[PDB]
Amino acid sequence: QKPSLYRVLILNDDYTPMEFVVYVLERFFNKSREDATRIMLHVHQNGVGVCGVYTYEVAETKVAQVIDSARRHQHPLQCTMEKD
Protein backbone atom coordinates (compact mmCIF):
# COMPACT_ATOMS: atom_id res chain seq x y z
CA GLN A 1 0.00 0.00 0.00
CA LYS A 2 0.91 3.68 -0.16
CA PRO A 3 -1.40 6.12 1.72
CA SER A 4 -1.16 9.33 -0.32
CA LEU A 5 -3.48 11.79 1.41
CA TYR A 6 -2.41 15.20 2.66
CA ARG A 7 -3.13 17.11 5.87
CA VAL A 8 -3.83 20.84 5.76
CA LEU A 9 -2.29 23.05 8.44
CA ILE A 10 -3.14 26.53 9.61
CA LEU A 11 -0.39 28.38 11.46
CA ASN A 12 -0.90 30.87 14.27
CA ASP A 13 -0.17 34.57 14.08
CA ASP A 14 -0.93 37.52 16.35
CA TYR A 15 -3.05 39.45 13.84
CA THR A 16 -5.73 37.25 12.25
CA PRO A 17 -9.02 37.38 14.21
CA MET A 18 -10.24 34.18 15.84
CA GLU A 19 -13.58 34.74 14.10
CA PHE A 20 -11.93 34.58 10.68
CA VAL A 21 -10.21 31.28 11.43
CA VAL A 22 -13.51 29.77 12.57
CA TYR A 23 -14.98 30.99 9.27
CA VAL A 24 -12.32 29.28 7.15
CA LEU A 25 -12.71 26.04 9.12
CA GLU A 26 -16.50 25.99 8.86
CA ARG A 27 -16.50 26.78 5.14
CA PHE A 28 -13.30 25.59 3.46
CA PHE A 29 -13.04 22.55 5.73
CA ASN A 30 -16.71 21.76 6.25
CA LYS A 31 -16.30 21.92 10.03
CA SER A 32 -19.13 22.08 12.54
CA ARG A 33 -19.08 24.98 14.98
CA GLU A 34 -17.72 22.78 17.78
CA ASP A 35 -14.93 21.27 15.65
CA ALA A 36 -13.96 24.60 14.05
CA THR A 37 -13.73 26.19 17.49
CA ARG A 38 -11.59 23.35 18.85
CA ILE A 39 -9.15 23.57 15.94
CA MET A 40 -9.04 27.37 16.10
CA LEU A 41 -8.15 27.33 19.80
CA HIS A 42 -5.52 24.67 19.09
CA VAL A 43 -3.97 27.04 16.55
CA HIS A 44 -4.09 29.95 18.99
CA GLN A 45 -2.62 27.96 21.87
CA ASN A 46 -0.31 25.43 20.20
CA GLY A 47 0.76 27.52 17.21
CA VAL A 48 -0.58 25.11 14.58
CA GLY A 49 -3.76 23.15 13.88
CA VAL A 50 -4.80 20.32 11.56
CA CYS A 51 -7.73 21.36 9.38
CA GLY A 52 -8.26 17.95 7.78
CA VAL A 53 -6.89 15.28 5.47
CA TYR A 54 -7.68 15.22 1.75
CA THR A 55 -6.39 14.12 -1.64
CA TYR A 56 -3.50 16.13 -3.07
CA GLU A 57 -5.76 18.03 -5.48
CA VAL A 58 -8.31 18.94 -2.80
CA ALA A 59 -5.62 19.91 -0.28
CA GLU A 60 -3.89 22.13 -2.83
CA THR A 61 -7.25 23.74 -3.60
CA LYS A 62 -8.26 24.35 0.02
CA VAL A 63 -4.86 25.76 0.98
CA ALA A 64 -5.16 28.26 -1.87
CA GLN A 65 -8.73 29.09 -0.85
CA VAL A 66 -7.64 29.79 2.73
CA ILE A 67 -4.72 32.08 1.90
CA ASP A 68 -6.57 33.91 -0.88
CA SER A 69 -9.43 34.47 1.56
CA ALA A 70 -7.01 35.62 4.26
CA ARG A 71 -5.39 38.19 1.97
CA ARG A 72 -8.75 39.43 0.69
CA HIS A 73 -9.71 39.92 4.34
CA GLN A 74 -6.34 41.64 4.86
CA HIS A 75 -5.04 39.09 7.38
CA PRO A 76 -1.51 37.57 7.44
CA LEU A 77 -2.83 34.04 8.04
CA GLN A 78 -0.61 31.22 6.76
CA CYS A 79 -1.85 27.84 5.57
CA THR A 80 0.01 24.87 4.08
CA MET A 81 -0.25 21.16 3.30
CA GLU A 82 2.02 18.16 3.72
CA LYS A 83 1.87 14.37 3.46
CA ASP A 84 -0.32 12.72 6.09
Q: How many CB atoms lie within 10 A of CB 8?
A: 24
Q: Which residues contact 23 (CB under 8 A, 6 or more apart)?
A: none
Q: How many CB atoms lie within 10 A of CB 25?
A: 25
User: What is the CATH number for 44?
Assistant: 3.30.1390.10
Q: Which residues contact 68 (CB under 8 A, 6 or more apart)?
A: none
**How deeply is 43 buried, as exposed, middle or buried, from its count of CB atoms within 10 A (0-12, 13-18, 19+)?**
buried
Q: Domain of 40?
A: 1-84
Structure-determination technique: X-ray
The resolution, in Å, is 1.8
Query: How many domains, in total, are found in the chain?
Result: 1
Q: How many CB atoms lie within 10 A of CB 40?
A: 23
Report which of 14, 33, 30 is spatially closest to residue 66, judged by C-alpha positions. 30
CA 11 – CA 27 distance, rounded (Å): 17
**How deeply is 51 buried, as exposed, middle or buried, from its count of CB atoms within 10 A (0-12, 13-18, 19+)?**
buried
